[PDB]
């Protein structure tokens, strides 16, 4: 059986886009394909800029490491917030081999393996452009074998993960190469936590050795917000003139971006991407971000767009300002819808204007463009600009009031349904607890109908008694409590419904029938709880008591 196997490949039997028909299925397939292709050009336009930004991050970061790496001691570079993914380049410097050595904690169980891997990589790199011993006498004999001087650049990856005694002994080992006049050694430390956590794990003589020339480099993407602002601006120029961004959405972006520090840019890209997929999958008005689809107006579009609250406010203001009733009933529209979807919405260009004015005209760099865009959305840009004590004279030039335009609710990115929360950052164990406790929000209540009506599913019934119990539960008392909730008569009628099964009918007329059925269902639900991680047997060979492990609402 394949179900009892470790793994197996199924060559399915083959007996065209995932977008569905909206407007209760009355949308045309032409509009579905146009939504598909529209989403693809928006996604391509965003992601080309994102790829260019990521490539520029790589190029500038290699440039900074190459500048710091060049121009009788170690040359020490500390890369703070590195995550150790960058490929470090060394130049071509004549009459000198520049050899770069990567070491991970998995490649470093002891000092011997560090030296053997380092000298194997050194000998292989020197031969690439008679066997030898992979030890430090390769370093002292390097000019005798290859004729040129040696420059070793050690790159320790994930320094917060390597055993620090091994790393200390390896640095003390590499100190022995200082007596050779043809060797210089550079060390690169990929620090993730901070420098004070590193020097409390190293010995003081090693710190005194490393203090002769060291350079700190904040290599995080959070420093200065220079790369997050380019990604957010690329998303803004993708959706400029087509889609709006809500203050709820930008506040959600900021709140989720604060909770992750080492991986911020691709979380932002994932959130913006999923919002774009959700909008282009749920909204039939997406075809109207292109002006060539204005002849595709039908009835269902009009009754969907007539429920906009901006339209509601506009027509009640119209009955406030216009006394006669004949002009009001004429609007209650197709021609009025077209003339307002071609508005410029200059908040994106003005956000770019204040961004370049803050960066290149006031020499202020420590601003978040996402936070600035949120403050421009809520109308408090002055309360964001009154911090640096230099925008006081420019307070009146950068003024902007928000314009709540008509029919912007059909073209916006929001989160008022919690879909972005349920899909990207769910309350996983809370959802499991709430599905176990309630269960009528999962299984439908259709109106064995009687036993389905008056008896709960077994896992939810067990969880209702689990939650109200103490930390330590007696299993037999738990089974006694579970048996009281069950119907003693309707269950015995339920197992007699099928006359074809004869052994169950034989077991049904036993005087100990209902307790056996209750114990079987109880034991199956108890092992389901044990596999989920809800309970734990606090023993090995008795299995008489269990301990509660999970509490709802934590």
């Amino acid at each position: 059986a394949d179900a009892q196997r470790s793994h197996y490949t199924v060559y399915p039997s083959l007996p065209h886009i995932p977008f569905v028909k909206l407007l209760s299925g009355k949308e045309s397939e032409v509009n579905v394909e146009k939504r598909w292709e529209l989403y693809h050009q928006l996604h391509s336009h965003f992601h080309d800029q994102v790829d260019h930004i990521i490539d520029n991050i790589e190029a500038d970061l290699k440039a900074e490491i190459s500048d710091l790496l060049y121009s009788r001691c170690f040359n020490t570079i500390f890369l703070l917030g590195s995550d150790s993914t960058t490929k470090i380049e060394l130049k071509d410097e004549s009459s000198r081999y520049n050899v770069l050595i990567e070491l991970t904690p998995k490649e470093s169980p002891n000092v011997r393996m560090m030296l053997r891997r380092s000298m194997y990589k050194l000998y292989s790199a020197a031969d690439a452009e008679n066997d030898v011993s992979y030890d430090l006498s390769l370093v002292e004999n390097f000019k005798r074998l290859f004729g040129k001087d040696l420059a070793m650049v050690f790159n320790f990856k994930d320094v917060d993960s390597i055993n620090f005694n091994t790393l200390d002994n390896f640095i003390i080992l590499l100190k022995s190469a200082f007596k050779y006049d043809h060797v210089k050694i550079s060390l690169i430390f990929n620090i993730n936590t901070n420098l004070s956590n590193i020097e409390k794990n190293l010995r003081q003589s090693t710190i005194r050795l490393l203090k002769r020339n060291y350079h700190k480099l904040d290599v995080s993407s959070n420093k200065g917000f220079k790369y997050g602002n380019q990604i957010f601006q690329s998303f803004l120029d993708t959706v400029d003139g087509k889609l709006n961004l809500s203050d709820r959405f930008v506040e959600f972006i900021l709140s989720k971006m604060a909770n992750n520090t080492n991986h911020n840019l691709q979380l932002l890209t994932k959130m913006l991407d999923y919002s774009l997929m959700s909008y282009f999958f749920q909204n039939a008005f997406s075809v109207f971000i292109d002006p060539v689809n204005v002849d595709f107006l039908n009835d269902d579009y009009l009754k969907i767009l007539s429920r906009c609250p901006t339209f509601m406010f506009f027509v009640e203001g119209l009955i406030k300002q216009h006394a006669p009733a004949d002009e009001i009933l004429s609007l209650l529209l197709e021609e009025f819808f077209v003339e307002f979807l071609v508005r410029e919405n200059p908040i994106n260009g003005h956000a770019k204007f204040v961004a370049r004015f803050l960066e290149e005209e006031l020499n202020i760099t420590n601003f978040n463009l996402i936070e600035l865009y949120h403050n421009l959305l809520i109308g408090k840009l002055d309360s964001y600009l009154d911090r640096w004590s230099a925008c006081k004279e420019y307070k009146d030039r950068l003024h902007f009031e928000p314009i709540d335009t008509i029919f912007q609710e059909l073209f916006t990115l929001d989160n008022r349904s919690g879909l972005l929360t349920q899909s990207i950052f769910p309350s996983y164990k809370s959802n499991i607890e709430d599905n176990l406790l309630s269960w009528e929000q999962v299984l439908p209540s259709l109106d064995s109908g009687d036993l389905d009506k008056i008896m709960a599913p077994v896992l939810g019934q067990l969880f209702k008694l689990y939650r109200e119990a103490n930390m330590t539960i007696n299993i037999y008392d738990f089974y006694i409590a579970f048996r009281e909730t069950l119907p003693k008569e309707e269950i015995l009628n339920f197992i007699r419904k099928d006359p074809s099964n004869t052994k169950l009918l034989e077991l049904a007329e036993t005087p100990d029938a209902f307790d056996k059925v209750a114990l079987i269902l109880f034991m199956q639900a108890i092992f389901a709880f044990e596999n989920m991680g809800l309970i734990k047997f606090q023993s090995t060979k008795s299995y008489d008591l269990v301990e509660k492990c999970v509490w709802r609402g934590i």
Partner: protein, 52 residues
């Protein structure tokens, strides 16, 4: 926090994260957690002043 070893476990290799037998402990000194608590303006010393 576990992969940075600011938190540690009772076992170090082939770690069963989902087992209830595996327990957790802090792996920072008092000075590090003190400056972390002052970074977030949390009164961590108030939970230790009355105990000793």
């Amino acid at each position: 926090l576990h992969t940075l070893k600011l938190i540690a476990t009772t076992m170090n290799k082939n770690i069963d994260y989902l087992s209830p037998k595996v327990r957790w402990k802090v792996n920072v000194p008092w000075e590090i957690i003190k400056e972390i608590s002052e970074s977030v303006h949390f009164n961590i010393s108030d939970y230790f002043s009355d105990i000793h």
